[PDB]
Design a protein around this ligand. Structure first.
Ligand code: HEM
Length: 82
């Protein structure tokens, strides 16, 4: 099964308690990853609650980072908001 979230819902997850963001229409819960990110937590907090696909691709993440990112996926963006 697949869980779909709307932009309205995702936008609410941008506080000290929860950090979500969108990458290629998939929703990632990075709340517990913030402090482990070698690229820092500041760059993640700034994108919280929205689509960070361009910024993610602009820095050119390695294959290992992309494979790891999959562990944080909690769903996808609702088709109606795409
Ligand atoms: C979705 C989970 C993500 C994972 C698992 C992840 C993982 C990593 C890892 C392992 C690196 C080291 C370099 C590499 O292996 O490519 C890295 C560097 C970096 N990441 Fe991420 N990243 C994620 C999301 C993001 C996002 C959304 C942004 C931007 C909004 C971001 C910005 C950066 C920056 C700025 C660097 C450092 C680049 C440099 O030093 O030149 N990352 N990330």
């Amino acid at each position: 099964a697949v869980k779909y979230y709307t932009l309205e819902e995702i936008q609410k997850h941008n506080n000290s308690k929860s950090t979500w963001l969108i990458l290629h229409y998939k929703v990632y819960d990075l709340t517990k990853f913030l402090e482990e990110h070698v690229g820092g937590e500041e760059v993640l907090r700034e994108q919280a609650g929205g689509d960070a696909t361009e910024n993610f691709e602009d820095v050119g993440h390695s294959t290992d980072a992309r494979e790891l990112s999959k562990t944080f996926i909690i769903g996808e963006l609702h088709p109606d908001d795409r």
